[PDB]
């Protein structure tokens, strides 16, 4: 809206290009540490 | 069919263990990993394809041309 | 004729009426060239448009 | 073996004429494959 | 769009227009169409390509953006609590652009 | 910092490099050597045929990724790649045969070959000190001795299962008298090619080309090489008696020691780990104990494919590196 | 000798040393990440990165910026000879050890 | 059905994104993943009222040189071989009818039903091809018949 698309675009590839690189490299995944809940949210779920 | 030459991930020949695995699998009744364990294959990537891959070609060869 | 009544009989009017064809299935909607059909898969580093 | 084809039971080696006979010799089975060559061939193993 | 050409065999493109498309990646299709008049292409290149049709009609938003993972992407580096280094930052930059 | 990673039970802590006198007040660690040198050292493990294992110390993750990298890809090693084939009825589909073979491991160096080239086409290609072409037949003959009914199928019918060992080679003019003491042999031998009966038979010639890794794994000289990084524990507090034979209960058997209910909890050694960081799960065992490793000190190990003796297979990665640097110094550089 | 090595990148800089962005062929990180790491221990050095621009192409491209005085294709000869010196120290440690094994 | 396979869940390469898996090089080149895929074609021999049969004869052979390229690839038979490379083009299996075929015979005739229309199909395709198995064989009807594979 202000500078016009051809440089604002031009952040977006930067955007992806940045991204798609660094994520893998750093990293990022699930575990069943997260679903499952430990203790706790089972005894207060059992009331709730 | 056959025993995979390598495990899609070591690398190993895997090849050669096949026939000498079936051999203490049916004479000296043992268990598995066990088995493996002093077979040679300590990391289990390779390993799956010892407990995996059934044996086909001998169920084909049933079918072979001369019969 | 034969006596079964196949049912393919008409098309003339109906020719320009229905689903594919003369209607609005093959002149509105006419079969194209220089074209191509893929399945799709990623390309971040491939810049946008 | 080196002849040009096989029975599909018998497995039985025979070779043929034209317009001649679909049996073979020995099957009283029909069907039947045909021998491979002895002309060379060449896979790349990657 | 414009054409590149890669190896392999299949349409590739950048992420941020799949929405307009609404394409899911997955195992789905596509089809690709050229011009043919030269007039044609410069109609639909400088007008119905991306950079001038970014936004939706109906709200008036840009449809094209992060989807998915360069959303939580972005998130991860832009996260408070991390921190870089002039090596770090550096190699970063660079895979940026 | 201090060569020190975070273990933590959901993350981990400190990991690029971050040594060099870009990033500080004081400004240090900066390059030169000897101080590098005279830091840097180096330990094995131990050393055998078709496997080797050691470790390393005082360098950054970078240089070290590379001899992994370099290793596993961009080494040289040499493997019957293209397949010539003596007609072949049998069951397994003749080109999965041809990968087989085109992967089987051989025992023969490089150093004795050159590299194909895509120019000097049609025989030119292929030629005597550049190429190493291997033969087999066998049309399977049921032996006649027939002890009992399904015997392995072998005293049914000679040799069955076709093996490496199976594979000879013809040597040719200057081919022969190059490999003399140097018998051209498949490294293991035992592999199944392939299974048949008796009515089928299989012949080819395939041939041998030097190549690469990264190109295809056929091409590995190892099977797997790897660097673990070398495990490190801190602890606190005596936190002696049965709760501490808890706490090593809690890692593998190597884990840390205990000379007595007395004197606590002590590292035996360490390297046994798995680094698996249970401990933080018990919750108890938290406060005494951080869990890490050090950026520094390399566990780092491979496995011979068979094709020679992985010290020099390492050597040889490091100078293929220090090559690929040197021809890109005296290289020019056009603007 | 061959010419297409390293084509260096002239919208890249501006002039006199300073910045330059160059393209390595047929090369990766292998090289680079390890390149990258005793370059950027040289002092009057401020950014030099890699990356590839896309894996299913061959091309490796490295970006070099520093603080006036010394060039960035001076500073690339300086830090790739030392890596020369690195391996130098590899093999001269490491096969002394080993030949004492 | 299926392969047994080591699987990490990451970002890795942001080529990642939506459902898109990646795989590993010299692991599909180790072997993985692999497939062949069995096709066939067929063909029924049909005679006519013209009392004439249609001839799989050919094989040219110019020059003494070498069996076309356009066609070659056959055989002395002249049909497809055996374990042969086969590619797009050429012919693995050539069916020749007469062009008096088609028309009312009459019992008149002297010499010539030498007249052959050939339609040789083509193996079209986007990459070469293999012929492990061919089929001469018959039906109920007493009449030449070949379905083969690739
Ligand atoms: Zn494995
Ligand atoms: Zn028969």
Redesign the pocket.
């Known amino acids: 809206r202000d500078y016009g698309p051809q440089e604002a675009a031009n952040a977006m590839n930067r955007m992806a290009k940045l991204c798609a690189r660094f994520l893998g490299n750093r990293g990022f995944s699930i575990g069943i540490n997260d679903v499952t809940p430990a203790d706790d949210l089972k005894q207060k779920k059992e009331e709730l | 069919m056959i025993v995979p030459v390598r495990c899609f991930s070591c690398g190993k020949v895997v090849g050669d263990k096949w026939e000498s695995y079936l051999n203490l699998l049916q004479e000296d009744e043992l268990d598995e990993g066990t088995a493996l364990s002093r077979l040679g294959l300590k990391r289990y990537c390779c390993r799956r394809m010892i407990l995996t891959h059934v044996d086909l070609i001998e169920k084909f060869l049933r079918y072979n041309p001369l019969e | 004729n034969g006596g079964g009544k196949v049912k393919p009989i008409r098309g003339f009017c109906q020719r320009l009426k229905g689903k594919q064809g003369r209607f609005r299935g093959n002149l509105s909607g006419k079969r194209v060239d220089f074209s191509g059909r893929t399945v799709i898969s990623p390309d971040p580093n491939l810049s946008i448009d | 073996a080196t002849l040009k084809y096989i029975?599909?039971?018998?497995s039985?080696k025979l070779s043929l004429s034209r317009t001649d006979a679909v049996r073979?010799?020995?099957?009283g089975?029909r069907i039947?494959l045909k021998a491979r060559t002895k002309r060379l061939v060449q896979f790349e193993a990657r | 769009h414009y054409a590149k050409i890669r190896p392999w065999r299949t349409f590739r493109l950048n992420e941020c227009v799949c929405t307009p498309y609404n394409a899911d990646f997955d195992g789905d299709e596509m089809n690709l169409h050229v011009p043919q008049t030269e007039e044609a292409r410069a109609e639909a290149i400088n007008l119905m390509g991306v950079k001038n049709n970014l936004l939706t009609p109906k709200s008036g938003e840009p449809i094209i953006a992060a989807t998915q993972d360069f959303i939580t992407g972005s998130y991860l580096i832009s996260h408070k609590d991390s921190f870089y280094d002039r090596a770090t930052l550096t190699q970063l930059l660079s895979m940026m652009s | 910092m201090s060569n020190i990673v975070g273990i933590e039970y959901n993350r981990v802590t400190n990991t690029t490099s971050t040594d060099f006198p870009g990033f500080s007040k004081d400004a240090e660690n900066e390059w030169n050597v000897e101080k590098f040198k005279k830091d840097f050292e180096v330990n094995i493990s131990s050393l055998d045929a078709r496997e080797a294992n050691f470790d390393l110390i005082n360098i950054d993750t970078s240089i070290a990724n590379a001899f992994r990298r370099i290793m596993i890809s961009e080494v040289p090693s040499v493997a019957a790649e293209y397949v010539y084939f003596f007609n072949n009825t049998s069951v397994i589909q003749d080109e999965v045969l041809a990968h087989r073979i085109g992967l089987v491991p051989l025992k023969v160096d490089p150093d004795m070959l050159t590299w194909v080239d895509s120019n000097l086409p049609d025989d030119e290609k292929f030629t005597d000190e550049n190429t190493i072409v291997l033969s087999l037949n066998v049309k399977c003959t049921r032996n006649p001795d027939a002890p009992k009914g399904s015997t392995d199928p072998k005293e049914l019918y000679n040799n069955a299962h076709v093996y490496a060992r199976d594979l000879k080679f013809e040597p040719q003019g200057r081919q022969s008298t190059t490999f003399a003491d140097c018998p051209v042999v498949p490294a293991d031998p035992d592999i199944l090619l392939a299974k048949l009966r008796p009515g089928q038979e299989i012949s080819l010639k395939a041939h041998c080309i030097l190549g690469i890794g990264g190109d295809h794994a056929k091409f590995s000289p190892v099977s797997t090489a790897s660097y673990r990084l070398l495990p490190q524990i801190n602890i606190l507090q005596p936190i002696k008696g049965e709760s501490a034979r808890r706490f090593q209960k809690c890692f593998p058997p190597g884990v840390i020691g205990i000379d007595e209910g007395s004197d606590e909890a002590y590292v035996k050694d360490a390297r046994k780990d798995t680094v698996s960081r249970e401990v933080l799960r018990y919750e108890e065992f938290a406060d005494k104990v951080k869990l890490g490793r050090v950026r520094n000190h390399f566990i780092f190990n491979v496995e011979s494919a068979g094709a020679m003796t992985p010290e020099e297979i390492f050597f040889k990665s490091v100078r293929i590196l220090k090559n690929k640097a040197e021809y890109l110094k005296n290289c020019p550089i056009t603007q | 000798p061959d010419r297409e090595k390293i084509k260096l990148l002239t919208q890249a800089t501006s002039e006199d040393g300073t910045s330059a962005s160059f393209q390595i062929v047929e090369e990766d990180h292998t090289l680079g990440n390890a390149l990258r790491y005793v370059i950027m221990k040289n002092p009057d050095v401020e950014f030099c990165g890699y990356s590839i621009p896309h894996p299913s192409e061959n091309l490796l491209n490295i970006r070099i910026q520093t603080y006036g005085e010394t060039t960035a294709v001076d500073a690339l000869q300086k830090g790739l000879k030392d890596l020369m010196d690195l391996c130098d120290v590899v093999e001269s440690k490491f096969t002394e050890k080993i030949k004492s094994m | 059905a299926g392969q047994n396979a080591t699987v990490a869940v990451m970002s890795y390469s942001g080529y990642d994104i939506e459902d898109a898996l990646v795989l590993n090089k010299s692991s599909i080149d180790r072997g993985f993943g692999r497939c062949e895929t069995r096709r066939k074609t067929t063909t029924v021999l049909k005679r006519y009222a013209n009392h004439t049969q249609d001839i799989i004869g050919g094989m040219r052979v110019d020059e003494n040189g070498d069996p076309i390229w356009q066609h070659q690839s056959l055989g002395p038979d002249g049909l497809g071989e055996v374990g042969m490379k086969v590619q797009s083009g050429q012919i693995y299996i050539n069916k020749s009818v007469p062009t008096n075929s088609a028309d009312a015979p009459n019992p008149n005739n002297v010499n010539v039903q030498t007249q052959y229309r050939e339609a040789p199909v083509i193996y079209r395709g986007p990459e070469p091809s293999h012929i492990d198995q061919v089929m001469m064989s018959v039906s109920d009807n007493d009449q030449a018949l070949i379905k083969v594979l690739l």
């Not at chain 4, 073979?24 to 099957?27: E, G, I, P, Q, S």
């Open positions: 029975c599909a039971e018998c039985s073979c010799k020995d099957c089975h039947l």
